[PDB]
Design a protein around this ligand. Structure first.
Ligand code: CLA
Ligand code: CLA
Ligand code: CLA
Ligand code: CLA
Ligand code: CLA
Ligand code: CLA
Ligand code: CLA
Ligand code: CLA
Ligand code: CLA
Ligand SMILES: CCCCCCCCCCCCCCCC(=O)OC[C@H](COP(=O)(O)OC[C@@H](O)CO)OC(=O)CCCCCCCCCCCCCCC
Lengths: 141, 151, 147, 63, 90, 29, 742, 39
């Protein structure tokens, strides 16, 4: 399945705060979260203060991914509304982040390959002396 | 005597301490009517004081150069009351307490909600287990030999 | 690692101030450095021990040198009971006149500190008698430091 | 394996109830289940949990 | 009425010069030449660093080694007779 | 008193300046 | 339509809930699995918000709770009066206030504690009290122990009535939410009925009982020989002999000839020379005027008739260009959230207690109070502490509102939102001003210490070197001293002797009050005060403003008000909760108040208090060393702490020995807190694992599993023992010092 | 009444009564046999 496209949709109503983007957005990376609201309504900003989401498509730029998943969590939990978010680099490149494969990570979905899964109980990790002078950790085996 | 100490009944500084104490009390006593409550109080303090010094002298206590009772705990038989005896008494009482508590915890260990009787005391049970402590050395000694003391 | 600390690219890739602190704080924990082996461990420890020895010898030579140069060792060996052993002279441009007057103890011609390390009693007991002895010992320990 | 309600000793070293005893609730018959032996304990762990899954080599039926 | 543009990431992330003015040099042309010719030796940062460190140290050493007694009480030294120590010690 | 007027500001002001600048540049590289 | 709304029998009265610990919480009611349960039971006991969501039930709970508190206080007052009647030297003290030490506690003779009953005078042996009850009782006109007994009985009765009122208004007739929400009516009744009629009727007691009896006492007549208070009401002839105005009855009052009442309603100011306290005539007039003011003030808000303001209207009327909607929405917030109210009221009540401390030192309202240095020092310190604590509480509950009650989707306010939108600027600015203040106050002290140590006193910041004069405060002093002649013509003297100009009031050979000089040292300490207060504000305000979210923790609000952290991630997030900000703010409040009370103690002992010789020679307790000693940390270390701790450290073998014991005990508890503050519960849990093993070995392991304290409780225990320790230390120090050299 | 008794059997009340009784005992003993340093 192909990821969601990212157009220029209007941003929520807000008078502006001091909790928004900084130089990190300019030099390193920032983030963008989009959602579709049934009506105009008030929501609390992750960066502090109250804003108004418009009806239809909404696009909000945040400084951290955690802020994005926080806002999105509040959207899905309180306003019963689906959301997505991407990471954006200064060169213009956009990386689709969440939800990765179109399905929320809470519920299982075929197609996902395991990462960092050790097929052994945690107590069966080797002692540090077993990995001395190697680059390996007892949990990397 | 022991440790180069001098007996309190023979100690000069001990007596001088009693003197200065009583004289301080009297110096305070001078300001009150003899029949008034403060007078009776201070006088009670004086009598209690001299009775205290006299009793310490009688008990066979040894005094330092400070004029104060020092204690001999080496096991010396002339001073078993200075640690050995009250020590035995203590051990008896502490053993009593611990053994009773142990009994109580064991008694409620096998129940629906044991923690309940730990926050709300079963006073009948506690009163039943209360006097069992009187024979705690005998009870524990037998449990030691039996194998009911540890797991 | 492309930057400080060179012994840990994990810390070297830290974009924060932490990178510096930890860099200083893990500098002697050889076992946890990058690409280390038992050999490098023992060899670095050995060299480090030599370094420590050098620092000790240099320190002692400093003590000897300062007692000989700015102290009253001879006056002390002539009268150990009534002479306060001078550790070293003091030159602090922050001082006021009362401070200068007050800190002029012993037979000094200026402000000094009185030694409480007891190097006087030690050196005098073992055989040192003159400033020259102290100087020669200082030079010898400096030589041991270099060695 | 052991029966339901069987008193078993815990052999998993990293368990809160290690070297202690618990009661068997149910054993999964699915051979793919890595830790079938469901055990329940008298005291909760630091996570306020009173039940845990173990393997066949992590329990020891005693009495 | 939007604030997101991939082609213009500059305006998107507020990378603006709030008070920088494109105005030409308002300074004195003669003084400009004066400074551009006379202050030039100090415009090489390595050479400037060496000059400031070595020169600064040299100056400090000068004024320090030749400090009058009327300025520093530490160079003037004690002027009153010494007092005896607590236990009759010098 | 002659030498201290030379060595004290040397070790107390010049040396730590040189060392701090050097270490700064080293750590920033 | 404001009216009496009540539900009948909402909760059945039964001991059934008494036998079920933690009934209020579904979690706690289930019982204990671990020991943690126990602590929780006490921690959430009065957190009614975590009990129910219903605002009404909570409101009822708080109402009856308040009744319980009032009951307790009445029982407390009852105790004070009863002890003043049965176990005191009060009458003897009345006979000779200047040479008898106030005592109203006696100890039983066991284990030698009898020594605590010291020579307080009046042929009595006991503990000298520093609460100041004797001067109150003298001011109220009380002369006998019988009257104190009666007041005790009255207070006990009132305790019963308050308790019954609690039970009644919780179990029998419990008010509706609309009733509690009638804020216009509540404000009216509290302004006019409570304060107004309170000071009015009190002015009644003062004019009919206090004034005459005190006039007699001051005249010198034996208290037993003084006419009973009821006689001055029955026989107007007596009052007429004392104040001829009463000869014309209440006629000049209604005829507006108020000038005739200048006999007992004065406006002199300053202090009564033969008592060292404010003029009781001035006080009566004060309470009368205050009564009028509050009485008319209680008619401001609209209730059941057309007249009167609406709170919401006044709020919605105030909105500017900078603030947009202004105060709109605040009425709804302040009529649905107990925590917001508690915040405001705690801040203001604390501040009030502070102003009470200052005003009571500088304008002694009770007779023979100013010369009872022990009492004055005690009162100042006490009320200062209470104030600081209440303020910290204000921060706490502000934050608690911020987490639990704030909801911008239903109860929005523009001001709060705008505050939240520039919180970074606010906190950063407070930060900077704190660093600046710290440098330019403490740095002056370190500067002085260094210059003093280097033999350069001419380079210090002092009155004899580089001067830093409190010009502004000096100007205010001069202005207030010259006020009686210019801007307050009807006033005879100044409002306080402490102003820059004036004479000197002394009583019984002791200095009551004199003009307080302000120099460089005072500039220094005042800026220290500004600094410490600013830091405390920084911590607390940062705590409440970032309680909901930060760039670090975007969803902090969901973690609650009180939680240890959000893990070692993000570099480490310990103490991010607003509760932890209350926790740190407590330490800083302790700091500030400590240096404040030290300031007061030293200044008073140095430049004010002391004995006065004939011809006017004043010898102060510490001989004016403040101006020269308080400018270095070493001066406080030696001339204040070291020098004045003498009395406490050699108090053994005397009646003040309890203060030595408490000195040591407080030091101990203080150090003991450091174990909790410096450590963490992991270590303790593992240690507990080993000990538990030992208990299992002997079959004595409890079913309620022994658990280490939670992180938060570790912090709470820490700060609690820290405060108790430090404060009790300064307590013992102060009391031993001032009782021995006073 | 049974509930009240249960409440009286709760840990803090039990402790107050127990330590109250103990305090009374030790006090009276130290009043009758005062200044005891031996036995
Ligand atoms: C520091 C180690 C130490 C220990 C563990 C003891 C222990 C004891 N001492 Mg000793 N004591 C010590 C040092 C010590 N002492 C020193 C340094 C001196 C000064 C020299 C003494 C002087 C001293 C005297 C004069 C006496 C003791 C006695 C005792 C015993 C008390 C009576 C008893 O146990 O009931 C019954 C005793 C037994 C069941 C056997 C204990 C004797 C055997 C030989 C051991 C006890 C075994 C008393 C004693 O031994 O009475 C018999 C006794 O009279 N002590
Ligand atoms: C025989 C001597 C000796 C040697 C060779 C070592 C060697 C080591 N120690 Mg050990 N240790 C020792 C004794 C020794 N230790 C002693 C005496 C203590 C008790 C203090 C310890 C307690 C200890 C701990 C807790 C740890 C080590 C660790 C280590 C390893 C890393 C050290 C490092 O990189 O720190 C880097 C150096 C610094 C961070 C600077 C140290 C300076 C300290 C902070 C004080 C400076 C304050 C200064 C004097 C103030 C100025 C005063 C002025 C302003 C007036 C290294 C193998 C670490 C380790 O790797 O364990 C796995 C580790 O965690 N040591
Ligand atoms: C090693 C121990 C030691 C210590 C603690 C001191 C301490 C002192 N010296 Mg002395 N000094 C020493 C050894 C020492 N010295 C030796 C061995 C010599 C013979 C070369 C001298 C020659 C000397 C002179 C001529 C003077 C001092 C002076 C002083 C005082 C002012 C500091 C200064 O400017 O000296 C500067 C010290 C040097 C130039 C010699 C040190 C060079 C060695 C070889 C290298 C040291 C590197 C060091 C270990 C690095 C540490 C920092 C690093 C860890 C980051 C101070 C009390 C001054 C004084 O007495 O004022 C009252 C002064 O005028 N020293
Ligand atoms: C440890 C080494 C050290 C030494 C040798 C000094 C020496 C001095 N300090 Mg101190 N200072 C130090 C550390 C030191 N400081 C530290 C760590 C602190 C912070 C705690 C201070 C805080 C401090 C303050 C606040 C003041 C001093 C002052 C002084 C001067 C004494 C007053 C005087 O009458 O001189 C006479 C001084 C003059 C006649 C003017 C000096 C002009 C200098 C010599 C020109 C040097 C130029 C050159 C480019 C310097 C570059 C050096 C750099 C490259 C390394 C003296 C030069 C006083 C001062 O600086 O007065 C102006 C002063 O007010 N110091
Ligand atoms: C006298 C008969 C009586 C009885 C049988 C009850 C019974 C009940 N009350 Mg009621 N109530 C009463 C009188 C009574 N009350 C009085 C006089 C008041 C006014 C204070 C109230 C006000 C009131 C409120 C506000 C609430 C109750 C509640 C309850 C129910 C649960 C309370 C509980 O079990 O904890 C029993 C509590 C204790 C045993 C502790 C007593 C705490 C005292 C009073 C505080 C003062 C102690 C003081 C600080 C001393 C400390 C000394 C030192 C150690 C520091 C229970 C049905 C609660 C309820 O119904 O929840 C749904 C509830 O919220 N009552
Ligand atoms: C606020 C409480 C209070 C109370 C309960 C009283 C009560 C009394 N006052 Mg007092 N009075 C008060 C405050 C109070 N006063 C204050 C604040 C002042 C200063 C203005 C006075 C000034 C004053 C004077 C000058 C006189 C009284 C008198 C009286 C008595 C007769 C009043 C009367 O019955 O008229 C009838 C009631 C109405 C018409 C209503 C009565 C005991 C009279 C008195 O003492 O006679 C023996 C009297 O002559 N009062
Ligand atoms: C105006 C009075 C007032 C009222 C009605 C409240 C009410 C409340 N506070 Mg608040 N608060 C106040 C003032 C007030 N506070 C002040 C002055 C401070 C600054 C210290 C605070 C700081 C504060 C914090 C940090 C917290 C609260 C919390 C609460 C809530 C739970 C309280 C509870 O159940 O604890 C039960 C009561 C106790 C456990 C009492 C024990 C307290 C210590 C141990 C006693 C101190 C020892 C004593 C001085 C001497 C001991 C002598 C001897 C026994 C050794 C409750 C709504 C909590 C909350 O969660 O709110 C939602 C919370 O976390 N308050
Ligand atoms: C709780 C434990 C306790 C015990 C075992 C005793 C035991 C005794 N008391 Mg009591 N007493 C107690 C608590 C206790 N008291 C308390 C709490 C009070 C305060 C009300 C008293 C007040 C009191 C008085 C006034 C008297 C006693 C007396 C006595 C003795 C009477 C025979 C007896 C030894 C009598 C006695 O023998 O005094 C010398 C006696 O006159 N007691
Ligand atoms: C922790 C060590 C410790 C020890 C060993 C003692 C021991 C003693 N204290 Mg001290 N005390 C302590 C800590 C200690 N105290 C602390 C921490 C404080 C501060 C609170 C005090 C404050 C204090 C005071 C004010 C007094 C004492 C007194 C005493 C003596 C009382 C004798 C007695 O009670 O009659 C004998 C008691 C019994 C026999 C009790 C047992 C009764 C049962 C029912 C027997 C059952 C048999 C079946 C005794 C020597 C008194 C004294 O006279 O000192 C010399 C005294 O007046 N203590
Ligand atoms: C004091 C200055 C003052 O009171 O300003 C008053 C200024 C303007 O207030 P408004 O007139 O907008 O307020 C109207 C209503 O909100 C209050 O009646 O408030 C600010 O804009 C914040 C200024 C913070 C300045 C930094 C501190």
């Amino acid at each position: 399945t192909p990821p969601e496209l990212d157009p220029n949709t209007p941003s929520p109503i807000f008078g502006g705060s001091t909790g928004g983007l900084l130089r990190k957005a300019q030099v390193e990376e920032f983030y963008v979260i989009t959602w579709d609201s049934p009506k105009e309504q008030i929501f609390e900003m992750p960066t502090g203060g109250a804003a108004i989401m418009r009806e239809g498509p909404n696009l909000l730029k945040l400084a951290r991914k955690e802020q994005c998943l926080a806002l999105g969590t509040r959207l899905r939990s309180k306003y019963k509304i689906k959301y997505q978010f991407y990471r954006v680099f200064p060169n213009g490149e956009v990386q689709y982040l969440h939800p990765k494969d179109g399905v929320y990570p809470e519920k299982v979905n075929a197609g996902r390959q395991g990462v960092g899964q050790n097929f052994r109980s945690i107590g069966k990790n080797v002692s540090p002396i077993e990995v001395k002078f190697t680059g390996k950790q007892p949990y990397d085996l | 005597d022991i440790s180069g100490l001098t007996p309190c009944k023979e100690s000069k500084q001990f007596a001088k301490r009693e003197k200065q104490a009583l004289k301080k009390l009297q110096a305070s006593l001078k300001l009150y009517a003899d029949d008034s409550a403060p007078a009776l109080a201070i006088k009670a303090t004086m009598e209690k004081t001299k009775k205290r010094f006299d009793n310490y002298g009688k008990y066979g206590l040894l005094c330092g150069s400070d004029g104060l009772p020092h204690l001999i705990v080496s096991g010396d038989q002339r001073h078993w009351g200075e640690f050995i005896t009250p020590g035995i008494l203590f051990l008896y009482i502490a053993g009593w307490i611990g053994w009773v508590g142990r009994s109580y915890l064991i008694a409620i260990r096998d129940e629906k909600k044991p923690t309940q009787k730990e926050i709300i005391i079963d006073v009948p049970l506690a009163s039943r287990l209360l006097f069992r402590g009187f024979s705690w050395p005998v009870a524990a000694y037998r449990e030691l030999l039996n194998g009911e003391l540890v797991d | 690692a492309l930057r400080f600390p060179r012994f840990s690219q994990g810390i070297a890739q830290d974009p924060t101030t932490r990178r510096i602190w930890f860099g200083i704080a893990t500098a002697h924990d050889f076992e946890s450095h990058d690409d280390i082996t038992e050999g490098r461990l023992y060899q670095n420890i050995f060299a480090s021990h030599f370094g420590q020895l050098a620092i000790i010898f240099l320190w002692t030579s400093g003590n000897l040198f300062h007692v000989a140069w700015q102290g009253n060792f001879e006056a002390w060996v002539q009268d150990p009971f009534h002479v306060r052993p001078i550790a070293h002279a003091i030159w602090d441009p922050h001082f006021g006149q009362p401070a200068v007057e007050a800190f002029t103890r012993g037979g000094a011609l200026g402000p000094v500190n009185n030694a409480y390390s007891g190097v006087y009693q030690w050196w005098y007991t073992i055989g040192l008698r003159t400033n020259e002895d102290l100087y020669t010992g200082a030079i010898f320990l400096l030589f041991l430091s270099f060695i | 394996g052991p029966k339901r309600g069987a008193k078993v000793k815990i052999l998993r070293k990293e368990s809160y109830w290690y070297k202690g005893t618990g009661s068997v609730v149910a054993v999964d018959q699915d051979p793919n289940t890595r830790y079938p032996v469901v055990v329940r304990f008298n005291k909760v762990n630091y996570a306020n949990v009173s039940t845990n899954n173990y393997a066949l080599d992590e329990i020891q039926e005693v009495e | 009425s939007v604030y997101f543009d991939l082609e213009d990431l500059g305006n998107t992330t507020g990378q603006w010069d709030s008070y920088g003015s494109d105005a030409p040099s308002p300074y004195n042309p003669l003084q400009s030449k004066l400074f551009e010719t006379f202050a030039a030796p100090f415009t090489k940062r390595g050479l400037l660093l060496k000059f400031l460190i070595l020169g600064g140290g040299s100056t400090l050493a000068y004024l320090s080694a030749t400090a009058s007694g009327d300025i520093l009480p530490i160079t003037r030294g004690p002027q009153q007779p010494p007092k005896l120590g607590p236990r009759g010690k010098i | 008193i002659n030498l201290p007027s030379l060595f004290v500001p040397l070790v107390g002001l010049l040396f730590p300046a040189v060392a701090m600048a050097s270490l700064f540049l080293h750590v920033e590289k | 339509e404001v009216k009496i709304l009540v539900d009948r029998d909402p909760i059945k009265t039964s001991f059934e809930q008494w036998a079920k610990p933690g009934h209020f919480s579904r979690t706690i009611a289930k019982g204990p699995d671990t020991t943690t349960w126990i602590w929780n039971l006490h921690a959430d006991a009065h957190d009614f918000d975590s009990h129910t969501s219903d605002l009404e039930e909570i409101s009822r709970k708080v109402f009856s709770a308040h009744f319980g508190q009032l009951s307790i206080i009445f029982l407390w007052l009852s105790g004070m009066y009863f002890h003043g009647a049965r176990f005191s030297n009060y009458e003897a003290w009345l006979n000779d206030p200047t040479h008898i030490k106030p005592s109203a506690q006696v100890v039983w003779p066991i284990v030698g504690q009898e020594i605590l009953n010291g020579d307080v005078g009046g042929g009595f042996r006991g503990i000298q009290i520093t609460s100041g009850f004797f001067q109150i009782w003298r001011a109220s006109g009380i002369t006998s122990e019988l009257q104190l007994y009666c007041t005790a009985i009255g207070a006990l009765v009132f305790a019963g009535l308050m308790l019954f009122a609690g039970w009644f208004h919780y179990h029998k007739a419990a008010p509706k939410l609309a009733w509690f929400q009638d804020v216009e009516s509540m404000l009216n009744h509290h302004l006019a009925g409570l304060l107004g009629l309170g000071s009015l009727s009190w002015a009644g007691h003062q004019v009919h009982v206090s004034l005459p009896i005190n006039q007699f006492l001051n005249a010198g007549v034996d208290p037993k020989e003084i006419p009973l208070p009821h006689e001055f009401i029955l026989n107007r002839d007596l009052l007429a002999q004392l104040y001829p105005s009463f000869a014309e009855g209440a006629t000049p009052f209604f005829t507006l000839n108020w000038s005739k009442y200048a006999d007992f309603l004065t406006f002199r100011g300053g202090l009564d020379p033969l008592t060292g306290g404010l003029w009781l005539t001035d006080i009566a007039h004060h309470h009368l005027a205050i009564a009028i003011l509050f009485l008319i003030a209680g008619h401001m808000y609209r209730t059941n008739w057309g007249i009167g303001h609406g709170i919401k209207d006044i709020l919605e009327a105030h909105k500017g260009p900078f603030t947009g909607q202004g105060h709109k929405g605040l009425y709804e917030i302040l009529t649905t959230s107990w925590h917001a109210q508690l915040s405001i009221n705690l801040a203001m009540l604390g501040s009030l207690t502070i102003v009470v401390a200052q005003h009571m030192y500088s304008m002694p309202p009770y007779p023979y109070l100013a010369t009872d240095y022990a009492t004055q020092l005690s009162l100042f310190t006490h009320h200062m502490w209470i104030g600081g604590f209440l303020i910290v509480g204000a921060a706490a509950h502000a934050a608690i509102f911020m987490v639990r009650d704030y909801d911008p989707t239903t109860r929005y306010n523009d001001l709060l939102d705008r505050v939240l939108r520039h919180r970074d600027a606010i906190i950063s600015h407070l930060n900077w001003v704190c660093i600046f203040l710290g440098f330019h106050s403490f740095g002056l002290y370190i500067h002085n210490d260094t210059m003093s140590a280097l033999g350069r006193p001419q380079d210090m910041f002092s009155d004899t070197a580089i001067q830093l004069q409190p010009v502004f405060a000096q100007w205010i002093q001069n202005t207030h001293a010259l006020a009686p002649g210019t801007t307050a013509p009807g006033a005879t003297a100044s409002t306080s002797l402490t102003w820059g100009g004036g004479d000197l009031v002394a009583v019984g050979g002791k200095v009551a009050l004199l003009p307080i000089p302000l120099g460089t040292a005072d500039f220094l300490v005042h800026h220290i005060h500004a600094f410490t207060i600013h830091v405390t504000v920084l911590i607390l305000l940062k705590g409440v403003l970032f309680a909901r979210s930060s760039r670090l923790i975007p969803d902090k609000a969901n973690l609650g008000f009180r939680f240890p952290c959000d893990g070692p991630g993000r570099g480490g997030t310990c103490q991010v909760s607003a509760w932890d900000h209350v926790f740190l703010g407590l330490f800083w409040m302790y700091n500030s108040i400590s240096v404040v009370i030290f300031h007061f103690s030293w200044k008073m002992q140095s430049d004010v208090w002391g004995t006065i010789n004939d011809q006017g020679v004043v010898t102060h307790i510490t001989a004016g060393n403040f101006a020269q000693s308080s400018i270095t940390i070493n001066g406080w270390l030696r001339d204040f702490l070291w020098a004045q701790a003498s009395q406490v450290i050699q108090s053994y073998g005397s009646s003040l020995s309890a203060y030595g014991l408490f000195f040591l005990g407080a030091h101990f508890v203080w150090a003991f807190s450091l174990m909790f503050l410096f450590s963490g519960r992991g270590y303790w849990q593992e240690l507990i694992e080993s000990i538990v093993w030992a208990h299992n070995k002997l079959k004595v392991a409890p079913a309620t599993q022994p658990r280490a304290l939670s992180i938060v409780q570790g912090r709470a225990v820490g700060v609690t023992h820290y405060l108790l320790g430090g404060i009790a230390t300064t307590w013992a120090f102060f009391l031993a010092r001032i009782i021995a050299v006073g | 009444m049974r509930d009240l008794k249960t409440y009286l059997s709760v840990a803090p009340v039990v402790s107050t009564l127990w330590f109250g009784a103990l305090a009374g005992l030790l006090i009276e003993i130290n009043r009758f046999f005062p200044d005891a340093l031996i036995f």
